[PDB]
Design a protein around this ligand. Sequence first.
Ligand SMILES: CC(C)[C@H](NC(=O)[C@H](OCc1ccccc1)[C@H](O)[C@@H](O)[C@@H](OCc1ccccc1)C(=O)N[C@H](C(=O)NCc1ccccn1)C(C)C)C(=O)NCc1ccccn1
Lengths: 99, 99
Amino acid sequence: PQITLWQRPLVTIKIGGQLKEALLDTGADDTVLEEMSLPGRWKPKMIGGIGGFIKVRQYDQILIEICGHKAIGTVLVGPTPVNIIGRNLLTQIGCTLNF
Amino acid sequence: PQITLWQRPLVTIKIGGQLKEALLDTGADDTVLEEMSLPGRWKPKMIGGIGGFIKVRQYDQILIEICGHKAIGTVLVGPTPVNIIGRNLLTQIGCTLNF
Ligand SMILES: CC(C)[C@H](NC(=O)[C@H](OCc1ccccc1)[C@H](O)[C@@H](O)[C@@H](OCc1ccccc1)C(=O)N[C@H](C(=O)NCc1ccccn1)C(C)C)C(=O)NCc1ccccn1
């Protein structure tokens, strides 16, 4: 679909059989989700944002459905204010910026 | 144009007679630029994201040129490590997310 930006570009995503709201963020290299349980082993990663850096848990090859489009990739879990869908998954669903 | 997200969507902007590189950021409510001098009176503001909050200076009615398109809006100036063009200005140039 086509999403304007007068409001936050929030979409519904499905992960671990649960529905959550997440922000489509072209300014994020990675996808960062709020604290939750995911399968498998995780690796450590440090990511930087506007306020500085935070420590997150990296899970690989995670299945996530964004607005009905299935994607399988890396997801970071940590103290983020909101769920963020980054470029790593936006490219998987063919998302582009237009103007 | 149509911008893909394989790489960070960086563009050239013009503000106060200066050419700067900025990130088209759909995950940003506001536009935040690295420390610089702007005309007029400003108001202090606290903005947050990944990592926490930072104190910035808020300037209103600022003219910015983005890839040729002129836009007017509020611009925040502060210790951000990267220049960010947020939704307040992305809307003015007719920017949308598509997939
Ligand atoms: C791991 C990624 C998260 C990271 N990218 C960013 O931090 C982007 O910023 C560019 C950026 C990149 C590096 C350093 C600083 C800035 C984001 O899009 C950012 O803009 C946005 O974050 C998502 C978000 C949305 C809503 C609430 C909280 C958080 C955010 O902080 N939005 C704020 C916002 O809208 N806040 C609203 C709010 C809601 C609730 C509570 C408080 N505030 C704005 C005021 C900035 C990244 O790619 N680092 C690699 C990287 C890239 C380049 C250089 C170095 N590393």
